[PDB]
Amino acid sequence: PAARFQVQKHSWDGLRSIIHGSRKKAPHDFQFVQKTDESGPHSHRLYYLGMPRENSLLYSEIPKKLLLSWKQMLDHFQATPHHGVYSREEELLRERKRLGVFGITSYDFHSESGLFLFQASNSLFHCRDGFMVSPMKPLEIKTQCSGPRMDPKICPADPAFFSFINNSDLWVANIETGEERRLTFCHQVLDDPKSAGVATFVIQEEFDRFTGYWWCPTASWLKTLRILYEEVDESEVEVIHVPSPALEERKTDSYRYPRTGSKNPKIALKLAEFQTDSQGKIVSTQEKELVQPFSSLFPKVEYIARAGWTRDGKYAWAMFLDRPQQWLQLVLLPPALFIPSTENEEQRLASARAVPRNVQPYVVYEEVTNVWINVHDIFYPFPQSEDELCFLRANECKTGFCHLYKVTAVLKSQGYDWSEPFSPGFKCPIKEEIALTSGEWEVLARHGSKIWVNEETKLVYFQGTKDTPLEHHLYVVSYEAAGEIVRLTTPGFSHSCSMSQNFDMFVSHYSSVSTPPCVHVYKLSGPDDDPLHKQPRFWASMMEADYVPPEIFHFHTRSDVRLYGMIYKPHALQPGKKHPTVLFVYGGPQVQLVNNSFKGIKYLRLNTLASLGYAVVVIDGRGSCQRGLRFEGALKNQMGQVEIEDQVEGLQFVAEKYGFIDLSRVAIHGWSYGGFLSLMGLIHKPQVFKVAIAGAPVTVWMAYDTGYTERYMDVPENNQHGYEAGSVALHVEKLPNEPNRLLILHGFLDENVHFFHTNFLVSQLIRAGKPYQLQIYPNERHSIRCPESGEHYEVTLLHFLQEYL
Amino acid sequence: AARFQVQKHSWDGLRSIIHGSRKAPHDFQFVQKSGPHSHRLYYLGMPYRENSLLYSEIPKLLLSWKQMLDHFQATPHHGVYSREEELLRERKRLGVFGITSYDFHSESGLFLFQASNSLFHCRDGGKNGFMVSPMKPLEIKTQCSGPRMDPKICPADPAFFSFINNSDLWVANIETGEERRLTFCHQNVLDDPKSAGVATFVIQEEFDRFTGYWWCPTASWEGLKTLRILYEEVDESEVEVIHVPSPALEERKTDSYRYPRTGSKNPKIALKLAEFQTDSQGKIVSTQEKELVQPFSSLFPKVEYIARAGWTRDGKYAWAMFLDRPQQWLQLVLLPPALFIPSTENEEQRLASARAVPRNVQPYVVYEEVTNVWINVHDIFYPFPQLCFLRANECKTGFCHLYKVTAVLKSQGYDWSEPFSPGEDEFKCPIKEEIALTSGEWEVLARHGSKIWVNEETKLVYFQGTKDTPLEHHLYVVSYEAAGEIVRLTTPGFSHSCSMSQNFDMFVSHYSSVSTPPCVHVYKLSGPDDDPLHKQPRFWASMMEADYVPPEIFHFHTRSDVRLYGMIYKPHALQPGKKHPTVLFVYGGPQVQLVNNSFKGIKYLRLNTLASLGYAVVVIDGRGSCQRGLRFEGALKNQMGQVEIEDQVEGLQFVAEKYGFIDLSRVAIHGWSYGGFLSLMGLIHKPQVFKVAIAGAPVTVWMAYDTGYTERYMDVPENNQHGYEAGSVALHVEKLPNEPNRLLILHGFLDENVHFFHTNFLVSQLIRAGKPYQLQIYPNERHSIRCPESGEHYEVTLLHFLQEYLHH
């Protein structure tokens, strides 16, 4: 009647000016340094990256006795290459981190020497920090190598040295003496498949590891410095072509992209040793391989998740995952199990006979599961004191929730003749395994989340949902006594925190649905006899700050499982009117759109929708993150099948509690996984969703990579019913016959979800005589960087809804 | 309101309409014989399945199409061709599964053709005897690995034949099974840029040549029977490389392509000679690479492309058509076989057999066509025995006409050992005479498979032309001996494609009109032999005879006093006084005429479907059009997209004044290929005129198009800044509508002619200009739609875009 609300129909010029009105990084990567000056006014110096232009190295002065200043470290200077055009290698590392920020995106620091190393321009730069006041020129490190120098790290044992990858080989260089040295020789495209120190595509894109080498923290005495590093051969991995950004050139780029049920790269851990004298020259280098082949020592291993060393460098270590990603073990690798590699079988067996029968790999932990093994970063080894090994470890697999565990595993040597080859199938006795935190909440140990362990006071600081899944909070618990867990961060808000290495101060970037992010400096003051109950006291603020925030709801299901949601309400609502509804979707795992943190930056378009009078509903459904393994396990082997049920469940719930929703004019829209679910919604529930606008969708699972699909959908061989059911390209017969009910968006340069996905869906749509609309983003990969396209993307989104909803 | 309104159909509705609406012998060979049948016409045809080798029996009435091959499938699994052949099939614009091109040797009666994977053959006629039941084709085995492109029988000896395999020339023997390789230019991708016998992408797409070798018609004997082949050696190393998607979509890989974009380096070219000797038993004995005594690029500087090549009928010379980069200077040159020396490793061995070459021997520049517009390449070049020869020459008058030329061959004598730079006309023969056999404001057909047939016994030259009217191809006869009376041999009112017997007694004519479907009538030429010019064409037998309202041809004069022709698809059941919406259908590129007197129903069925729903459809051959001579084609020179939209408006306002059922407030410009390019110019230059544009496979950037097409019309980018920057629709996106639903873009994702980049780059610039757009991909389609399932969709989207949007 007069009840149905009608969005003001605008001209396309009209929508451009509305959207142009819509748009009219905070401190991160923190290094705390104490001033070592009892009489001066500053107790600390915070180092970080931040903006006003580009990201850059900045510092604040923490006083002894309130906004801080952002003092610039670099004497003006530019870390962005002309026109923001990165190298091929650089731009492809910024997609795998979803990095969209120009300038210094990361750095390496050495508190002992004040050495700042960092990739900038198209080379490396460095600076030193007594304590300066005004900025300084960062000295460019001169090379004689050809291409870009990737993944720079300072040698912890000696800051005179540093490392980098160049043409997928490990190099080492001295910043003082400019001397550079290649340590590995795996390269000389497609013709060259071996690489060394490089984290391959699927390792970065789906296992969150980007470096493929690891400094030895200690030198052994000439001194000698080692580096652990993953040797890799992509010879058997399928090869695909994606269009270069240089469209004028009309050329592609080759990738090693292993589709599900395809060979992954052959992998191995190895050592690169080199010696140095008093004056500093690199006197010699040595390639070192495992005394037994990696593939036979650690069989069943498919991806190397993580690796590192003890703090003493006694042993190296590695997190190893099997193909079905249902099995995970941490292995102690002593530096002596590695020999000098050679072609002389005689020379090699004299090194193999010399490796003592006592030295051996110690499998120190193992995680089994019937769902899948999320890779958590957290594995902290305590220096061996009083034959054994004590360590903390975050274990979602034990109880189905990520929690911390202090573990001791016995290191009793079986003994082996390393000259003769053998085939096992090293599991240590666990001496004990104490639960430090438990419960139906969880510990944050993924996507850069970390702990900080003060051994002086015997406390583990961490980050968890203990209070609520809508808010990340900082927690301290003892690792001697598994007793009281003290929360230091204050409710209402979600926090991303950074602890000093002296555990005397923290920073907390925090925000809420209703208020923009702050970045506050809290000191930890109180009795030193009672450190578990240090009170956080606000010391200083580094950052304060048409938008109507949404509000979080919760509701249960016909399974009684609780789900949370957000609603943007139609701005200036007249209770009684029913409004057209846009259902904003993600629905994949490893994401949670619904949490108590300010949404206005990233989801500014959802408020713009609300400002035209659209109901924007957003619902974390079963499969979404932060809620533990059983809640995420809902997707496994049936992707696309469970997620829409909940989205319709939360949609109908929203219509009872809010009653401004017109169930007749609902629309589904998402990118990435969300696009994939926008198209499952229009197949299985077209009586519910009038239109679907699906962006960057996965239309064929068999064309997606192994590391993501197998973990959730298994191997095609074993789960065809699921691959076929969750492949929206095969169910195109069930997509609408009425035109204007489906808009397709895809970034033509997408090397993550390949434009082949839209391409093959349009092919199936044409065969089945289904209409469709299509937008291409010819200068865009999986996400849309360029502001120009963004406006266009949104102007199209508003016009498409206006005319056809 | 008296504004007609098209019925608004649901999407299923339009699918059922298009699906409703969609519910000729060629390559003829005449052979003589004795009982009831005089001849046997061999031909390719697709009897109501796939194109196949057929024969009719010309007796002393409708001819039966007899099967020559027994239960034989000539097309591979479904339509899954090799990559090399299916591009050969796109470059010839070939859309029929089965046998498409075949070779025939009348004396021995040898038929030879590409089929399925390999080569096949079957003898018939001559010394073997005539078949009455379909024959089984014999397989010619191969020790070669890849496909064998471009088979040809050796004219001088039918025991042998040639083929390209892996970018190299091979010769084999059908009898012995003996293969042998003659050219070693191929050893990989960019690391293997050399090739011999192959005609490079552009040659195929722009100069209409799909073979880079040519058999000698004769054999010589030195001191064993020696057979020669002229061939083009190719070096694509310095030619840009581009990646177009495979049709293996699930594979997610591309194919590389040596695509010379305009103002870019072209394949380094050269003519080499390949000799080989056979004995009594036909065993291949020696084989000889040979090459021009002096490099090709110093004997003939300024030559960018080998348009054409071949031999004289006695083999005394090999000839070639040479063309410059601008394409405004063409040459015909004889290359005496004695001008070729065996290629050798040694400086010292190369100067020995150079000293050895007689000074009397040399290349002779026979003919030299200059022009201020551009040289179209014309197939016709008939040398007589002995040098006298017939040639087609557009440049001379501005219309393509036959000329009889005598060239004087006088040697200047050259020291072939010493290195030699020629002067500006170092080899040009004195022309003794040059008589025009044909003249007038009408052209002889000499491109796209048009050919003359010359009867040396009677001194008559048989040709097809536009003499009567540009709307109709006709068969004419004239005498090269006496340039006098031109007798026409084909009925007027129809347009004829025609093929002449080598005995000049019967001819075929496949012909049609706007109003009548195609026929293939066989005609005998009778009349006393006293007078051969005036032999009446006597209808002998038919091979083919015989919803759709055919369109109406008209003509109008421009305000520049130029006569343009158009066509009108009348709105079915037209109520005079109603004003209907108008789909202006466009091409407008050169080398194309759409308005002629021939059946349009098969190719442009959508243009009658459009009419059935009640759209007016208007087709106009603006300037730049073909079949109207060089000054008419020349109108586009360095102005592509500047002259013809005016003509499309001019011919559209006209149709409005004449017929008076057109509604100029609802007109829609729509075309594919160059037509798409005009659609987008039409929406930039005349948005008051055209309310929606649907552009298919459009060229948006000329700087990303090939050299042979673009440089012949638009020059180098460094010599036509304005022209490239005016005729590039991607550079003028600011001038596209701020209003949405006024522009639909279409592009197949495997287009290797116009690269999908062109659209991709327009979409980049649309977005940068903040402009709406619609877009449809064709993921299994290059520069055209072969898969029907796509075609119907395309059509169903054309009706749906027009109905919802082309309004008020």
Side-chain angles (χ1 to χ4, degrees), chain A residues 82 245 296 308 406 582 771:
Chain A
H82 179 274
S296 72
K406 184 213 201 276
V582 169

Side-chain angles (χ1 to χ4, degrees), chain B residues 326-343:
Chain B
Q327 295 191 52
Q328 304 200 330
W329 183 306
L330 179 144
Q331 272 183 190
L332 268 155
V333 307
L334 311 179
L335 311 164
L339 181 68
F340 288 75
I341 74 167
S343 328

Side-chain angles (χ1 to χ4, degrees), chain A residues 12-13 16 239 241 250-252 703 737 739 759-760 763 767 769-770 772 775-776 778-779 792 804, chain B residues 11-12 241-243 250 252-254 738 755 760 768 770-771 773 775-777 779-780 789 793 800 805:
Chain A
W12 170 288
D13 274 333
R16 295 228 297 140
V239 210
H241 299 196
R250 284 183 255 74
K251 281 170 208 165
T252 31
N737 298 265
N759 197 33
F760 178 98
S763 198
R767 277 205 200 283
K770 306 298 176 166
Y772 69 90
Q775 306 287 90
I776 293 177
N779 307 310
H792 191 290
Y804 314 130
Chain B
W11 177 276
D12 301 317
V241 218
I242 78 131
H243 296 61
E250 339 284 317
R252 227 169 316 176
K253 270 206 149 206
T254 61
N738 295 39
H755 310 130
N760 200 223
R768 269 162 181 70
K771 301 274 179 178
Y773 67 78
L775 183 69
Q776 300 287 96
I777 277 175
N780 316 270
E789 304 126 66
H793 185 291
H800 175 271
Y805 307 136

Side-chain angles (χ1 to χ4, degrees), chain A residues 247-248 250, chain B residues 700-701 704 747 755-762:
Chain A
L247 298 185
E248 287 75 10
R250 284 183 255 74
Chain B
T700 65
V701 185
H747 223 308
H755 310 130
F756 182 82
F757 159 83
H758 280 113
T759 283
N760 200 223
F761 181 71
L762 170 62

Side-chain angles (χ1 to χ4, degrees), chain B residues 660-674:
Chain B
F661 56 72
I662 297 262
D663 181 4
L664 294 179
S665 89
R666 302 186 288 172
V667 179
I669 195 159
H670 161 68
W672 253 88
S673 191
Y674 193 110

